[PDB]
Paper text:
The active center of the enzyme contains three amino acids coordinating Zn2+ ion (H62, D69 and H117) and two additional charged acids (R41 and D114) bound to the water molecule for Zn2+ coordination, forming a charged groove important for PG binding. LysECD7 also contains the SxHxxGxAxD motif (60–69 aa) in the cleft region conserved for LAS-type enzymes. For endolysins acting against Gram-negative bacteria, the presence of an additional membrane-translocating domain is predicted, allowing the enzymes to cross the outer membrane of bacteria and reach the peptidoglycan substrate. There is no obvious characteristic sequence on the ether C- or N-terminus of LysECD7, but a region enriched in charged and polar amino acids is detected in the α2 helix around 44–61 aa of the chain, predicted to be intrinsically-disorder region (IDR) with strong polyampholytic properties (FCR = 0.44) and low overall hydrophobicity (2.76), also containing a putative antimicrobial peptide. It forms a protrusion covering the substrate binding pocket of the enzyme and is enriched in lysine residues along the inner surface. Such elements can lack a compact ordered structure, e.g., under conditions of neutral pH in vitro, while under certain conditions the structure is stabilized and the domain acquires functionality, either the IDR can fold upon binding to interaction partners such as PG and other bacterial cell membrane structures. Comparison of the solved structures of native and hybrid molecules revealed only a slight difference in two α-helices involving α2 and α5, which together with the β1-β3 sheet form peptidoglycan-binding pocket, resulting in a more closed cleft architecture of LysECD7-SMAP. We could not resolve the SMAP peptide structure, due to its high mobility, thus the LysECD7-SMAP model was used to perform molecular dynamics simulations. During the simulation the ‘core’ LysECD7 part remains stable (residues 1–131), while the structure of SMAP fragment is remarkably variable (residues 132–148), proposing the free interaction with bacterial membranes. Considering that unmodified LysECD7 lacks activity against other Gram-positive bacteria, e.g. S. aureus, we propose the substrate specificity towards A1γ-type peptidoglycan stem peptides specific for Bacillus spp. and most Gram-negative species.
Numbering used by the authors: 1 to 125
Write the structure that this text describes.
């Protein structure tokens, strides 16, 4: 049973929180949560620093988490370890009846990234 540290799911949408907790239960590789909610200021920097594309991002409204694998051999950035987690997120999505999206040959940045879909969980107007 993988136990979670002090992780800021606080303000993350409860549908996604519950998917998180369950994916952990059923994960081959232990993981943590790097970012949950991202401030509009932090977001602004990221656009200008040429990181993120639009001024829009799931992270603003608690509709995204990014994870980091803790895979024993310490091999933190191994593509596969993120797919083992995607699989665990998808399945917790199948239970719980939540449609979860994975970033997904998958770049690190895409592979750490989970969100609740736009249709079901839309941005404020």
């Amino acid at each position: 049973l993988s136990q979670r540290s002090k992780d800021r799911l606080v303000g993350v949408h409860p549908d996604l929180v519950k998917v998180v907790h369950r994916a952990l239960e059923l994960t081959p590789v232990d993981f943590g949560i790097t970012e949950g909610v991202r401030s509009l200021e932090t977001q602004k920097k990221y656009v200008a620093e040429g990181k993120s594309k639009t001024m829009k991002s799931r992270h603003l409204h608690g509709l995204a988490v990014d994870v980091v694998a803790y895979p024993k051999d310490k091999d933190t950035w191994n593509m596969k370890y993120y797919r083992m987690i995607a699989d665990a997120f998808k399945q917790a999505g199948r239970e719980l009846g939540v449609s979860v999206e994975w970033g997904g040959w998958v770049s690190f940045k895409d592979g750490v990234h989970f969100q609740l879909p736009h249709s079901k969980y839309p941005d404020p107007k």
